[PDB]
Amino acid sequence: LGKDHEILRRRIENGAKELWFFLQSELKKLKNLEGNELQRHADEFLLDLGHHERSIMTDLYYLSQTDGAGDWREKEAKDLTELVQRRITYLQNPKDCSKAKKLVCNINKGCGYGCQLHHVVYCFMIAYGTQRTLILESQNWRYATGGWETVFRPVSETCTDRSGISTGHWSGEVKDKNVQVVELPIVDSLHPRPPYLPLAVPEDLADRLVRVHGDPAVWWVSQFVKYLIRPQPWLEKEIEEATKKLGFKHPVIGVHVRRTDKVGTEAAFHPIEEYMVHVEEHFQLLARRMQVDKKRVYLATDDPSLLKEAKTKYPNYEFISDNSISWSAGLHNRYTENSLRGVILDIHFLSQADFLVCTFSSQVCRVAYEIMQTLHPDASANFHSLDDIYYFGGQNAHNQIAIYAHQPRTADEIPMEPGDIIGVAGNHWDGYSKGVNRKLGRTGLYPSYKVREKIETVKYPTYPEA
Amino acid sequence: LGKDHEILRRRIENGAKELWFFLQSELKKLKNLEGNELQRHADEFLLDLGHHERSIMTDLYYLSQTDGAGDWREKEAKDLTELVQRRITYLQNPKDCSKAKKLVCNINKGCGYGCQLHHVVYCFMIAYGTQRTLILESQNWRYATGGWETVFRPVSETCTDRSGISTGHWSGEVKDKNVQVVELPIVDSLHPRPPYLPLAVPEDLADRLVRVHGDPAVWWVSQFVKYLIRPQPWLEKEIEEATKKLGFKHPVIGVHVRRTDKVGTEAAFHPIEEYMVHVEEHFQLLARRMQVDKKRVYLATDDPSLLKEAKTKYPNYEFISDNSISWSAGLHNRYTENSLRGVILDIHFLSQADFLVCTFSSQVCRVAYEIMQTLHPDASANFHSLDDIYYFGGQNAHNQIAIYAHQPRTADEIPMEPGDIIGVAGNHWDGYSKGVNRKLGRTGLYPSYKVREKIETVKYPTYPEA
Ligand SMILES: *[C@@H]1O[C@H](CO)[C@@H](O[C@@H]2O[C@H](CO)[C@@H](O[C@@H]3O[C@H](CO[C@H]4O[C@H](CO)[C@@H](O)[C@H](O)[C@@H]4O[C@@H]4O[C@H](CO)[C@@H](O)[C@H](O)[C@H]4NC(C)=O)[C@@H](O)[C@H](O[C@H]4O[C@H](CO)[C@@H](O[C@@H]5O[C@H](CO)[C@@H](O)[C@H](O)[C@H]5NC(C)=O)[C@H](O)[C@@H]4O[C@@H]4O[C@H](CO)[C@@H](O)[C@H](O)[C@H]4NC(C)=O)[C@@H]3O)[C@H](O)[C@H]2NC(C)=O)[C@H](O)[C@H]1NC(C)=O
Ligand SMILES: *[C@@H]1O[C@H](CO)[C@@H](O[C@@H]2O[C@H](CO)[C@@H](O[C@@H]3O[C@H](CO[C@H]4O[C@H](CO)[C@@H](O)[C@H](O)[C@@H]4O[C@@H]4O[C@H](CO)[C@@H](O)[C@H](O)[C@H]4NC(C)=O)[C@@H](O)[C@H](O[C@H]4O[C@H](CO)[C@@H](O[C@@H]5O[C@H](CO)[C@@H](O)[C@H](O)[C@H]5NC(C)=O)[C@H](O)[C@@H]4O[C@@H]4O[C@H](CO)[C@@H](O)[C@H](O)[C@H]4NC(C)=O)[C@@H]3O)[C@H](O)[C@H]2NC(C)=O)[C@H](O)[C@H]1NC(C)=O
Ligand SMILES: Nc1nc2c(ncn2[C@@H]2O[C@H](COP(=O)(O)OP(=O)(O)O)[C@@H](O)[C@H]2O)c(=O)[nH]1
Ligand SMILES: Nc1nc2c(ncn2[C@@H]2O[C@H](COP(=O)(O)OP(=O)(O)O)[C@@H](O)[C@H]2O)c(=O)[nH]1
Ligand SMILES: [Cl-]
Ligand SMILES: [Cl-]
Ligand SMILES: [Cl-]
Ligand SMILES: [Cl-]
Ligand SMILES: [Cl-]
Ligand SMILES: [Cl-]
Ligand SMILES: [Cl-]
Ligand SMILES: [Cl-]
Ligand SMILES: [Cl-]
Ligand SMILES: [Cl-]
Ligand SMILES: [Cl-]
Ligand SMILES: [Cl-]
Ligand SMILES: [Cl-]
């Protein structure tokens, strides 16, 4: 038993004890206040609580690294990623391409870059589940009509040709067992749905994944994102060079302010301050554990006016941004190679930051977060997102299990019993989530701490030949 | 690296994260309320916060046990105490008692039983440090003119006689190096002071103790209490008998309400309710982890009126008490053998409880708390005390170290910089403590979480011969 482990655990315990003593002390005081004195005092309370909370959180972090837990998790995360990448590659490069089973995916989904990247990921996962080599057709890709190889390495070295002795539009893994080439539709109209979808992870990796990663769902998705966006030689140079021209050095917090056409239709408008509170709050967290010389925010946005506004409102922050990329993402010029390379770099630097603040309603941010999973052992927690929790457009039902019972205080809350299964609609980031208790078919709010994430598994192939 | 360990660590992180989301949300709501509506809501807040916090504490308890941490901690705590007991016994039992170095301690200090026991502990500790066998003179003991052996086995089987070729009153370990038998005075007039006092622990055990125990000072003191209170056969039988007759079964929470003469001069009067909140809060905690069939409180008091009052106010709690022991402790009849038997038994059952609630200003509670240390691996946190932090009457300076800087918000607070040394006067159990910042010599309040306990060591002998 390790001595730092025990000292840390004991300080995390006592930190909560003093936080609770303090909570009681100051709430009893607040009950007897009014007006300006109540607001002054409640605001000071929150300041003090913030620093308290950040000290507990910092101690928990150290606990996560002590006793070589840091070394081990990294080692084990590396071995897992190498294994899945070895299996994906093995699958993607059959010896005999004319005689290989194939899954044909077409990149031209009527949406944006991240929505399309995710369509190729969803295709890729099903190809991995069905043991079919992925044939990505990318001619006339609206962003770069040259095709996928304009920016990224092709998904296969040996098998890029979609030909075979029998081809058919998908109809089930059972029905298609002897169709050589299967054309796969977008998840929005897939029928029947195979088991090889998010957020389920492979049965065979699941135990190892839970030991290491806080959200094995995102980790599994990220494995295909990683392989896909393997970059062309010139793109690797463009990214490396742009890293130099921009002042991009860690410690940096990545921020994605998505506006333009998303507002109103798929997500809300959020002011810059709504993002920057988490940025400052999480620089404060970082500063408790390392030296923070200047507070750098990498700012990815499609509002070109934002950069000037942000710099004036936050004069202590160095803002790293490529405002001309921001202009390139405006709609009049959005679907062009110049813009595509723009969003690929913005997403890159987002994924590379130490922490991410954004809206998970955007496919752009979600990909940044997915790519982030591949650059650390467990980067599952590295975001204070503003609206949706994580999801994979097309996933199966996202379920939780209640672990503590809850009795509804108002009519807007649902009751929970331990074991009850709750499908979550979202987290409100106020201590409550919204969801349906499937047992009683009632929808409402429940205290977010009272549920446990239900990890789902699938019997995927294990490709032992790699 | 362990899987239950990692799931647990992440839920403590996530549970604390949701607690902060909740704290921010509901405090912002409170800022805009008035009077009765503010009070309704603030009280509901506190109710919810309690259960949130108790869930975090429960996961922290479980983390304390996973990966066999529990099993190992017990074994190591067992090995330590067996070693210290083997060393004390060796010292107390020379082969030639006529030629042994001896330290003469006199039990009849002008105070009560616990204060006298603690005087004998201080003598024992100094005798251990100087390698002198403890000769405990106890005739005319105010509690039992029969002597120490009225209740307890003698502190030595071979060496109980105080004779030697040179005897003298203490004058320092260096000056007395060749006086065979040294008479030790009460700590109140010990001069010079030797290094062998609380709250310092032996140099060689300090690393092993910190791996195991949350308050190594108490663990070291309890080691001597343990050796001291080995009871005579009738008393051992009396304890077993009273255990059956009172119906003492775990889960039981010990409560010690000290009143009579202690009020006004040495401590405050506290209503039964001030104790019973911590009792319920902690049965609520226990109930989160085990079955609580009946809520048992063991009640030690010198107020014989309390038992009837308590039973009436708390009709859900089974009160295990010996009201006549409460009567035997009354002022007019306190210093007799039957009374001494009362307090010894009251202290026994207190130490035996799953948790202790009391005033540490009373030596009676402190002795129970010290004895409690020898019945569990780390039982240092098993109290929600009502005034003083733990201390040993006569001790050296109790120092903490500031670990996070603090700037004083009002005039009652002291400033701290990390590394600053804080002499602690006590904890207010409201999130603040009182103390002196020695570097700048200022006295005041500081947030209790911003300090770290300063463990002090002393080079004690190691008695290789056992
Ligand atoms: C055409 O273009 C687009 C690309 O731009 C292509 O991409 C698709 O675009 C949409 C929009 O982004 C994506 O839909 C989103 O899905 C989110 C995930 O939903 C699934 O999982 C959820 C939890 O993680 C769970 O809540 C859902 O039940 C759902 O899970 C489904 O479950 C089934 C089993 O039960 C499975 O079999 C299904 O497969 C599975 N479904 C999916 C999608 O896989 C979802 O959370 C998100 O909803 C939020 O945002 C909605 C706005 O789009 C909002 O709608 C508003 O609702 C309110 C009241 O309900 C109403 O007053 C208002 O007027 C509505 N606004 C509009 C315009 O509809 C939702 O209510 C919901 O709100 C969120 O609520 C939570 C909790 O309160 C908050 O924490 C949060 O703040 C809040 N979010 C926001 C920002 O408002 C949304 O539906 C889709 O995933 C994506 N698809 C793909 C495949 O990538 C599209 O594919 C292109 N089409 C074609 C033909 O190619
Ligand atoms: C006669 O019989 C008695 C048996 O009872 C024998 O035993 C002695 O009994 C007394 C009282 O029962 C014990 O006194 C207590 O000492 C506690 C420890 O003091 C040491 O450690 C402190 C930090 O923990 C440190 O700050 C102290 O100065 C001291 O540390 C010293 O350090 C020195 C180096 O600088 C060393 O060289 C010394 O060796 C070492 N000294 C000692 C004493 O060991 C102490 O915590 C405790 O103080 C609290 O309780 C007081 C009441 O007893 C309370 O008094 C009030 O003071 C305010 C202003 O200060 C005054 O206006 C008011 O009138 C007083 N009110 C009352 C109720 O009387 C103190 O304020 C203090 O308050 C505590 O404050 C914190 C935070 O503010 C709260 O969390 C807490 O609730 C609160 N406590 C209470 C109960 O209110 C007390 O002084 C004594 O230790 C013990 N000595 C021994 C050696 O056994 C005695 O031996 C017999 N004598 C003879 C002739 O045989
Ligand atoms: N370079 C850049 N482009 C963006 C940004 N936000 C949106 N875009 C552009 O808008 C498209 C958004 O489409 P999509 O990937 O489907 O994400 P979503 O509409 O926000 O859910 C991206 O592919 C980019 O062309 C940004 O922050 N930086
Ligand atoms: N049996 C019994 N005796 C008590 C109790 N509380 C106080 N006394 C008596 O009062 C004495 C108080 O002396 P002491 O040990 O110095 O404790 P203190 O005065 O509270 O610090 C005890 O030793 C007992 O004689 C109690 O709960 N049970
Ligand atoms: Cl092959
Ligand atoms: Cl299928
Ligand atoms: Cl760097
Ligand atoms: Cl600023
Ligand atoms: Cl499960
Ligand atoms: Cl399956
Ligand atoms: Cl395990
Ligand atoms: Cl040992
Ligand atoms: Cl000897
Ligand atoms: Cl007397
Ligand atoms: Cl000395
Ligand atoms: Cl006997
Ligand atoms: Cl029992």
Tab-separated table of C-alpha atoms in Angstrom, chain B residues 196-433:
chain	number	residue	atom	x	y	z
B	196	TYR	CA	9.587	12.283	24.545
B	197	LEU	CA	6.188	14.058	24.688
B	198	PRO	CA	3.101	14.239	22.459
B	199	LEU	CA	2.198	14.947	19.825
B	200	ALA	CA	5.483	13.615	18.501
B	201	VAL	CA	5.702	10.001	17.314
B	202	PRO	CA	8.813	7.763	17.298
B	203	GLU	CA	11.124	8.474	14.375
B	204	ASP	CA	11.358	4.838	13.278
B	205	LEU	CA	7.612	4.166	13.162
B	206	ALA	CA	6.657	7.414	11.465
B	207	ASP	CA	6.802	6.244	7.854
B	208	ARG	CA	4.889	3.029	8.609
B	209	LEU	CA	2.302	4.913	10.703
B	210	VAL	CA	1.496	7.441	7.950
B	211	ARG	CA	0.891	4.608	5.476
B	212	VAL	CA	-1.753	3.291	7.936
B	213	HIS	CA	-3.057	5.914	10.334
B	214	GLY	CA	-4.649	9.354	9.928
B	215	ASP	CA	-3.429	10.813	13.263
B	216	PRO	CA	-0.179	9.135	14.307
B	217	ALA	CA	0.038	11.169	17.525
B	218	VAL	CA	-3.108	9.550	18.905
B	219	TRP	CA	-1.898	6.146	17.757
B	220	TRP	CA	1.335	6.529	19.749
B	221	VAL	CA	-0.447	7.725	22.903
B	222	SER	CA	-2.979	4.909	22.669
B	223	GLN	CA	-0.152	2.374	22.632
B	224	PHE	CA	0.573	3.229	26.266
B	225	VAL	CA	-3.092	3.472	27.292
B	226	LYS	CA	-3.442	-0.037	25.838
B	227	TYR	CA	-0.680	-1.410	28.040
B	228	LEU	CA	-1.973	0.526	31.041
B	229	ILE	CA	-5.634	-0.562	31.160
B	230	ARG	CA	-5.089	-4.375	31.185
B	231	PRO	CA	-7.792	-5.032	33.787
B	232	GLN	CA	-7.873	-7.231	36.851
B	233	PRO	CA	-9.936	-10.439	36.513
B	234	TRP	CA	-13.008	-9.181	38.387
B	235	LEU	CA	-13.085	-6.108	36.169
B	236	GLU	CA	-12.651	-8.177	33.020
B	237	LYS	CA	-15.607	-10.269	34.179
B	238	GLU	CA	-17.579	-7.132	35.027
B	239	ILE	CA	-17.075	-5.828	31.488
B	240	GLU	CA	-18.191	-9.050	29.794
B	241	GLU	CA	-21.218	-9.231	32.095
B	242	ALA	CA	-22.258	-5.630	31.580
B	243	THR	CA	-21.866	-6.078	27.822
B	244	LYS	CA	-24.507	-8.822	27.858
B	245	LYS	CA	-26.774	-7.127	30.397
B	246	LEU	CA	-26.882	-3.725	28.611
B	247	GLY	CA	-27.486	-5.341	25.216
B	248	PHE	CA	-24.465	-3.676	23.538
B	249	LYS	CA	-24.445	-4.696	19.842
B	250	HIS	CA	-22.772	-2.972	16.942
B	251	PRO	CA	-23.977	-0.733	15.155
B	252	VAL	CA	-23.873	1.604	18.196
B	253	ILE	CA	-22.740	5.239	18.374
B	254	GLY	CA	-21.187	6.331	21.628
B	255	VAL	CA	-22.207	9.706	23.036
B	256	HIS	CA	-20.528	11.262	26.100
B	257	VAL	CA	-22.337	14.271	27.567
B	258	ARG	CA	-20.038	15.801	30.205
B	259	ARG	CA	-21.717	18.363	32.473
B	260	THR	CA	-21.632	18.794	36.298
B	261	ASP	CA	-18.596	20.812	37.371
B	262	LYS	CA	-16.973	20.905	33.918
B	263	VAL	CA	-19.541	23.527	32.868
B	264	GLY	CA	-18.458	27.148	33.056
B	265	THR	CA	-14.895	26.681	34.093
B	266	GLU	CA	-13.518	24.078	31.691
B	267	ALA	CA	-16.129	23.649	28.920
B	268	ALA	CA	-19.568	24.648	27.656
B	269	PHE	CA	-22.951	23.170	28.422
B	270	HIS	CA	-24.380	21.451	25.349
B	271	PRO	CA	-27.996	20.376	24.863
B	272	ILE	CA	-28.722	16.797	23.962
B	273	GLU	CA	-29.685	17.962	20.444
B	274	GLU	CA	-26.249	19.432	19.653
B	275	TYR	CA	-24.887	15.892	19.970
B	276	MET	CA	-27.795	14.058	18.383
B	277	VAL	CA	-27.533	15.808	15.004
B	278	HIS	CA	-24.087	14.341	14.449
B	279	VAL	CA	-25.449	11.020	15.687
B	280	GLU	CA	-28.240	10.993	13.110
B	281	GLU	CA	-26.066	12.378	10.328
B	282	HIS	CA	-23.743	9.487	10.958
B	283	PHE	CA	-26.376	6.792	11.222
B	284	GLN	CA	-27.544	8.153	7.884
B	285	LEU	CA	-23.990	7.626	6.613
B	286	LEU	CA	-23.801	4.112	8.076
B	287	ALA	CA	-27.232	3.318	6.677
B	288	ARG	CA	-25.816	4.135	3.229
B	289	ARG	CA	-23.328	1.271	3.539
B	290	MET	CA	-24.936	-1.397	5.778
B	291	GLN	CA	-28.195	-2.512	7.353
B	292	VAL	CA	-29.234	-0.382	10.344
B	293	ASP	CA	-31.979	-2.361	12.096
B	294	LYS	CA	-32.200	-0.286	15.272
B	295	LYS	CA	-30.285	2.931	15.943
B	296	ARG	CA	-28.349	2.287	19.182
B	297	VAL	CA	-26.685	5.119	21.141
B	298	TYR	CA	-24.419	4.245	24.048
B	299	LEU	CA	-24.852	7.197	26.405
B	300	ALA	CA	-22.122	8.015	28.953
B	301	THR	CA	-23.066	10.934	31.171
B	302	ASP	CA	-22.650	12.357	34.643
B	303	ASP	CA	-26.089	14.030	34.320
B	304	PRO	CA	-28.459	11.301	35.601
B	305	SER	CA	-31.405	13.389	34.348
B	306	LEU	CA	-30.265	13.042	30.756
B	307	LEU	CA	-31.300	9.457	30.025
B	308	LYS	CA	-35.010	10.009	30.589
B	309	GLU	CA	-34.837	13.287	28.641
B	310	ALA	CA	-32.983	11.693	25.722
B	311	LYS	CA	-35.351	8.712	25.450
B	312	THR	CA	-38.292	11.102	25.239
B	313	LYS	CA	-36.841	13.440	22.608
B	314	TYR	CA	-35.409	10.635	20.438
B	315	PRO	CA	-37.999	7.838	20.545
B	316	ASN	CA	-36.492	6.139	17.497
B	317	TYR	CA	-33.124	5.531	19.140
B	318	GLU	CA	-32.394	2.663	21.487
B	319	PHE	CA	-30.395	4.206	24.349
B	320	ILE	CA	-27.900	1.881	26.037
B	321	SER	CA	-26.958	3.513	29.340
B	322	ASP	CA	-26.353	2.612	33.005
B	323	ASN	CA	-28.143	5.514	34.679
B	324	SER	CA	-26.794	4.530	38.085
B	325	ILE	CA	-23.208	4.806	36.815
B	326	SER	CA	-24.346	8.323	35.848
B	327	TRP	CA	-25.410	8.721	39.486
B	328	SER	CA	-22.182	7.184	40.868
B	329	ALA	CA	-20.263	9.889	38.959
B	330	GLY	CA	-22.033	12.702	40.805
B	331	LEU	CA	-19.788	15.245	42.468
B	332	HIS	CA	-20.513	14.427	46.108
B	333	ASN	CA	-19.560	10.737	45.660
B	334	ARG	CA	-17.128	10.727	42.745
B	335	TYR	CA	-13.840	9.530	44.229
B	336	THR	CA	-14.532	5.930	45.233
B	337	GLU	CA	-13.973	2.463	43.804
B	338	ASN	CA	-17.567	1.959	42.627
B	339	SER	CA	-17.360	5.336	40.865
B	340	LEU	CA	-13.978	4.462	39.362
B	341	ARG	CA	-15.521	1.235	38.143
B	342	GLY	CA	-18.290	3.283	36.567
B	343	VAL	CA	-16.054	5.547	34.541
B	344	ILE	CA	-13.792	2.687	33.472
B	345	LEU	CA	-16.777	0.829	32.067
B	346	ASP	CA	-18.320	3.962	30.531
B	347	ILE	CA	-15.016	4.641	28.782
B	348	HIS	CA	-14.798	1.016	27.659
B	349	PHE	CA	-18.149	1.021	25.868
B	350	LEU	CA	-17.501	4.454	24.390
B	351	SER	CA	-14.217	3.294	22.810
B	352	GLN	CA	-16.056	0.235	21.497
B	353	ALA	CA	-18.630	2.165	19.496
B	354	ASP	CA	-18.593	2.492	15.739
B	355	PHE	CA	-18.414	6.256	16.149
B	356	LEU	CA	-17.948	8.720	18.990
B	357	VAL	CA	-19.738	12.029	19.596
B	358	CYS	CA	-18.608	14.145	22.543
B	359	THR	CA	-16.565	17.104	23.812
B	360	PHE	CA	-12.854	16.534	23.495
B	361	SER	CA	-12.447	19.098	26.258
B	362	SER	CA	-13.257	16.170	28.569
B	363	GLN	CA	-10.440	13.729	29.304
B	364	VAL	CA	-13.114	11.012	29.504
B	365	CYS	CA	-13.944	11.310	25.831
B	366	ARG	CA	-10.264	11.663	24.890
B	367	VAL	CA	-9.438	8.387	26.647
B	368	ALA	CA	-12.271	6.580	24.877
B	369	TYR	CA	-11.026	8.078	21.621
B	370	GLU	CA	-7.434	6.979	22.317
B	371	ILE	CA	-8.545	3.452	23.320
B	372	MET	CA	-10.690	3.420	20.163
B	373	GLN	CA	-7.462	3.676	18.123
B	374	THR	CA	-6.454	0.147	19.198
B	375	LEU	CA	-9.714	-1.530	18.053
B	376	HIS	CA	-9.574	-0.488	14.353
B	377	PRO	CA	-6.832	0.039	11.759
B	378	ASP	CA	-7.433	3.762	11.266
B	379	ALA	CA	-10.152	4.975	13.619
B	380	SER	CA	-8.744	8.509	13.778
B	381	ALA	CA	-11.740	10.039	11.909
B	382	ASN	CA	-14.472	8.350	13.993
B	383	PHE	CA	-15.762	11.441	15.747
B	384	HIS	CA	-17.786	14.587	15.059
B	385	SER	CA	-16.555	16.313	18.364
B	386	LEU	CA	-18.236	19.463	19.713
B	387	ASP	CA	-15.486	21.870	20.796
B	388	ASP	CA	-11.746	21.199	21.056
B	389	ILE	CA	-9.780	19.295	18.451
B	390	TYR	CA	-7.739	16.429	19.885
B	391	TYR	CA	-4.974	17.330	22.317
B	392	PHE	CA	-2.843	15.759	25.046
B	393	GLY	CA	-2.715	17.945	28.131
B	394	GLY	CA	0.906	19.025	28.470
B	395	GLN	CA	1.865	18.468	24.805
B	396	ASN	CA	4.300	20.391	22.673
B	397	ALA	CA	3.199	22.917	20.045
B	398	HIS	CA	0.503	21.690	17.680
B	399	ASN	CA	1.630	22.918	14.275
B	400	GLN	CA	0.036	22.756	10.859
B	401	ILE	CA	1.500	23.900	7.556
B	402	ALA	CA	-0.354	26.190	5.197
B	403	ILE	CA	-0.689	24.486	1.813
B	404	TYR	CA	-2.791	27.076	-0.037
B	405	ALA	CA	-2.390	30.788	0.500
B	406	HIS	CA	-5.206	32.719	2.148
B	407	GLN	CA	-5.883	36.433	2.067
B	408	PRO	CA	-8.017	37.751	4.983
B	409	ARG	CA	-11.478	38.884	3.947
B	410	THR	CA	-12.308	40.487	7.327
B	411	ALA	CA	-10.373	41.483	10.423
B	412	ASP	CA	-10.931	38.105	12.117
B	413	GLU	CA	-8.861	36.248	9.517
B	414	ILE	CA	-5.102	35.843	9.304
B	415	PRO	CA	-3.098	35.830	6.074
B	416	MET	CA	-1.281	32.675	5.009
B	417	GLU	CA	1.343	31.838	2.391
B	418	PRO	CA	2.147	28.213	1.521
B	419	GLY	CA	4.813	26.921	3.859
B	420	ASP	CA	3.802	29.292	6.673
B	421	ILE	CA	3.538	27.503	9.981
B	422	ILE	CA	0.257	27.762	11.850
B	423	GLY	CA	-0.080	26.977	15.545
B	424	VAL	CA	-3.664	25.682	15.791
B	425	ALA	CA	-5.909	26.617	18.695
B	426	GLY	CA	-8.898	24.668	17.472
B	427	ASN	CA	-11.373	24.003	14.710
B	428	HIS	CA	-14.717	25.755	14.693
B	429	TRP	CA	-16.399	23.011	12.632
B	430	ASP	CA	-17.755	25.775	10.353
B	431	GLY	CA	-14.963	25.610	7.786
B	432	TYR	CA	-12.615	27.866	9.739
B	433	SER	CA	-10.012	27.291	12.425
